[PDB]
Design a protein around this ligand. Sequence first.
Ligand code: MG
Ligand code: MG
Lengths: 98, 255, 267, 331
Amino acid sequence: QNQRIRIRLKAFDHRLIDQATAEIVETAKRTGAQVRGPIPLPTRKERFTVLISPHVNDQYEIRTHLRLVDIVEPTEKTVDALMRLDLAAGVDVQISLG
Amino acid sequence: MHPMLNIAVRAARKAGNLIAKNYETPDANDFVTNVDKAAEAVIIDTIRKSYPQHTIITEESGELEGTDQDVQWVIDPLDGTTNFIKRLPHFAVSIAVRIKGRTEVAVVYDPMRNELFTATRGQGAQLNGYRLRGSTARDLDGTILATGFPFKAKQYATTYINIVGKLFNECADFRRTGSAALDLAYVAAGRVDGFFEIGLRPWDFAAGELLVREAGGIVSDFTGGHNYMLTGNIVAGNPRVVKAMLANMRDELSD
Amino acid sequence: AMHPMLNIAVRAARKAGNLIAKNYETPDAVEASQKGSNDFVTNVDKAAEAVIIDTIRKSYPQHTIITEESGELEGTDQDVQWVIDPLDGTTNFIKRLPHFAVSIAVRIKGRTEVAVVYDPMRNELFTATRGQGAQLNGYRLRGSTARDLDGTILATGFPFKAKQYATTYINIVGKLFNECADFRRTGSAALDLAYVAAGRVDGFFEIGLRPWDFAAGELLVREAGGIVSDFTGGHNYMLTGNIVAGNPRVVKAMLANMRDELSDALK
Amino acid sequence: EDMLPRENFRPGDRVRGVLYSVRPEARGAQLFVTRSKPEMLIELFRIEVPEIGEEVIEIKAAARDPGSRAKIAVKTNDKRIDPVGACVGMRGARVQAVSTELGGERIDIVLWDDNPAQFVINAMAPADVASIVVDEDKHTMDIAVEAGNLAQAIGRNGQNVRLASQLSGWELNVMTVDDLQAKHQAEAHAAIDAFTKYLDIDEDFATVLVEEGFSTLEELAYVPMKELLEIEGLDEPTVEALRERAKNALATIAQAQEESLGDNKPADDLLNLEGVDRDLAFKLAARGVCTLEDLAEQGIDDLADIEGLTDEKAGALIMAARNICWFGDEA
DNA sequence: GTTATCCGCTCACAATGCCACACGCGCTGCTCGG
RNA sequence: ACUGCUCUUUAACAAUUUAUCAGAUCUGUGUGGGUGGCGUGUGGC
Ligand SMILES: [Mg+2]
Ligand SMILES: [Mg+2]
């Protein structure tokens, strides 16, 4: 079927990014899906600020990592295991299909 | 004092389960009398499992007497029936364990919100694990008064109206739910500061007065005495709001 | 299917209600911050408002929004307005009384188009969209079947912020109490209107209501078979804050009953 | 019970829960998922922290009061890592993630401890119990904080302790850590008055002789030279002057007896009232009424149990209180 | 001119009940649809 | 040829304010439930 099942993955954590990426590419290479590279684009600075009850009148810039992995073989069991096998929170999982 | 309350809350839970499970059926006062009688039946039959000798006082058949006249059990499986008639989810079972003319235990249970207020002398008034406190008010500014209208005794209404008028010029706002027992339970948990009502009947507020008293509050009749037990012209709350309200409401006495 | 704006609004309302409920169990953090004459605006109101606005901006960065707190935040497409009350009956919340709701309505070209109110405590979700009707968690809402004043239950709010009319109001109250069955006073005009839509109260009336409170209920009762009006049958209510609503016959009876007692200030 | 209390639901939305039982055979519902049982938390860390599940930081114990507070203690097997920097993570967000996922359910990531004393001590996440008295036969220990933070130690509705007792299994006791705590074990050496009033001139000489109790000084002071020869500092003129001071001390005990009977408050506003003798004053304060307003703060039911006070007498007395206070609305 | 008066014209509005039986009741070049 | 010479032994805490002695239901498959409106015409009485 269609090719560009391309998942970008932003986060501020690292090791769970590795866990999720490894699990995802596992599902890919196990379900017959021809996985492309994770290809982690350069880690980016991302601005925070303390938007809580502040100090009376604390990360503010973080290295958000980006894993831009691509899967080009959507079998049935691919989408099956994908929607089945879950991912940790704290990750931006804006994906693209095309 | 544990096992009395034990049977009390057991019957309360079963009655609430019945009431709710029934309330899940549609309709558009036959049904309410049906369910009231059924709840009273389950209540009393579960009671007779332990102490089938205490004298039960319902709200319908007077006083179902018994052979051990040391303990009376005031029962109302439904208060403010108007609610259950018109689907409004605000009604509670009210059980009161009284002895020698005075009350020792009290349990009000709202099935819908699954609230359950217990109360007993000394050991206090609990909400499923909370040492209740009543409100914190000391005045009639920024305060709430759980009111009540005579939907059977409208004659007082006029002077009652006057009270309301003056009360409105003093207090901050009003409430009205129809379940006098629930008004009492709310003043017990300080959800509303002061409570008052014109001509109530012991079967309803028996448990609620024990609640509000056990929560650090006090009750009274309209003229400060104690004939409320027979007159039901209740004024209840923590002494602060009770003074702040009586001082302005007694001067319009008609009962 | 479903109406889109309705869907995004109900998502916003779900998030807001969950936030309010989560904060409801820590009364040591939410304080009483008064704004006018006994209209508290706690920080939790601000947080819920911000959450709702954020959730909306995702799907409509161009729609002008209205809020009692932030006035009117203009949008690049101001033909459609989003009226919000993140909390109704702030007093009922500060007393930790578990009866309140968040209200979100969307007007198109001035005419109200969709409305939702959400009570988190009882977990009730009154939705309403013009041309499809009103629903309570999946049940249609045809209001009370009353056709007189006897046996009728009247929900109301008191002018506890416009106390000058108190007497007047109380006056009419007395008149009403001579014909109706019983009153109800809950403290949240949105939820009272909702109950009118659910027939749980045979009617409703109030004086001195902000334009950002009935906007989520007036459409509710309208698509709920009921009707609203000013204290005289006109439509200046949107400016007078004087509402009377209910099933049509009861509204007619109430208007014919109230027209005499009415102080000519509200007319 | 298996749901969270305030977790509103709606037909049409997806939710997460742990499959805690399967019943392929029973004549009804065959799948049982919960969200309240504590292991959920455990497994959710499995799905969140890339350390747990990799068997490096195992979850030892987790106690939970739903939607309110969940304590959790984990040990680490590799000294490379610790929970505060990885199990809490960066800026404490992973625990924040699972919190938000479970509906603001606040969590206490407490570093597991294997010393049962230090174990139950640390598991008190916000606290500082600087005075421990460990016992196993009853499982209870003096687990409390300095006076003032006792609320901060027990936490709201007992959570911050009700969980630890649930977590440690050892029953707990929270009374004090600075005051009122030596009373459990250092009670016969903590009476600062007499010992230091004798020590201020003894700080040049010596401490006092602890090898005898002498708390009940009367009999044990009538012991011969043996006790006085064995120890120094309690000289013969010292013992005699201190016997005069112990006359002062027994008179002090009698005077303290006298003082402990002073808060009854017989006032004109509380004595001359109708039906009130001085003994009615002593009875009304015998329940704890030290003013007149208090008398007006009880009903016949609550002013009861008095030794010789009926319902009509107390009734008219409440009436008098409410006249002098609430009927004329005066003071 | 006004002011009302009446008149020619226009238009609406009524047409026994039953029965029984019979017969019949979109189209057409746009729309869609693959 | 002709922008390119060490920066020096891995993530770096959110949790928080009376208070406690923890405080029976796991059933069914008895069953109702698995062509007309209008028009016109004819004829009859
Ligand atoms: Mg009743
Ligand atoms: Mg508002």
